[PDB]
Amino acid sequence: STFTEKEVYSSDKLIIKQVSPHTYVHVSFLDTDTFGKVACNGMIVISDGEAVVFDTPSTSNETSELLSFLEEEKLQVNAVVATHFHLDCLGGLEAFHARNIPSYAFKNTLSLASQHDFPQPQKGFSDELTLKVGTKAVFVHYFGEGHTQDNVIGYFPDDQVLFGGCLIKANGAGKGNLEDANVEAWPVTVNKISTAYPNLRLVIPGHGNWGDKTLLHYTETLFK
Ligand SMILES: [Zn+2]
Ligand SMILES: [Zn+2]
């Protein structure tokens, strides 16, 4: 019953893996002070020749590599979503903006990005955003604070896939960077996610290996 994952792009700086019929993980790498060399995940949803991207790679160069691949595949890139204000979500937004691809994020991500002098998403939403992807859609939803105050998820119901971003930890992973975190809210937010999407088959964390609903339960337990 498992989908046979397939690598569809690989370079020194970026890997893209198909993880379900319509969803893909993009992986870029961050050499950071306190935690080592860090893989950062985003998601691409592709259907009917159209694509929506969740998170940019941290750097402009890696984001251009991502967009070059989507262009070689002849895809219309409809939107990019920054799932919170940190650079492993939006460091590469100008590559999207240069191509007239609109960027979206939680309303508070816009103000936080501006206050940090980071690339700014163009369009804010307050609650739940629907983004068309071909004949399907992907949904962006705020369930509360956790990894940051503004973090949002992406939900693609056709394949029962959740992009948890940095609010969701890989199975067995540590708590990671808590500098901007609300650890009181975090388990409450994650339980709201589990309760909303009980049928999930695939959960993609912001860092590390993706998996199934286990990741939601693991993350809630880690912060309980
Ligand atoms: Zn973050
Ligand atoms: Zn992160």
Numbering used by the authors: 29 to 46, 48 to 100, 102 to 104, 106 to 107, 109 to 131, 133 to 150, 165 to 172, 1173, ...
Task: Please quote the paper that reports this structure.
The class B MBLs are enzymes with the ability to hydrolyse virtually all β-lactam antibiotics, including carbapenems. Phylogenetically, MBLs can be grouped into three subclasses, B1 to B3.2 While enzymes belonging to subclasses B1 and B3 carry two Zn(II) binding sites (Zn1 and Zn2), B2 MBLs are mono-Zn(II) enzymes. Here, we investigated three of these B1 MBLs,6 SHD-1, MYO-1 and ECV-1, in comparison with the clinically widespread enzyme NDM-1.
The structures of MYO-1 and ECV-1 were successfully solved by X-ray crystallography to 2.17 and 1.33 Å, respectively. The structure of ECV-1 was refined to an Rwork and Rfree of 0.16 and 0.19, respectively, with one molecule in the asymmetrical unit. In addition, MYO-1 and ECV-1 harboured in total three cysteine residues (positions 69, 121 and 221) within their active site. In contrast to the complex H-bond network in NDM-1 involving Ser69, Asp84, Lys121 and Ser262, we found different amino acids in MYO-1 (Cys69, Cys121, Gly262), ECV-1 (Cys69, Cys121, Gly262) and SHD-1 (Ala69, Arg121, Gly262). The lack of Lys121 or Arg121 in MYO-1 and ECV-1 was compensated for by an extensive network of water molecules. Interestingly, this loop was shortened by one residue at position 231 in both MYO-1 and ECV-1. At position 233, asparagine was present in both NDM-1 and ECV-1; however, we found tyrosine in MYO-1 and SHD-1. ECV-1 and SHD-1 exhibited thermostabilities ∼3 and ∼8°C higher than MYO-1 and NDM-1.
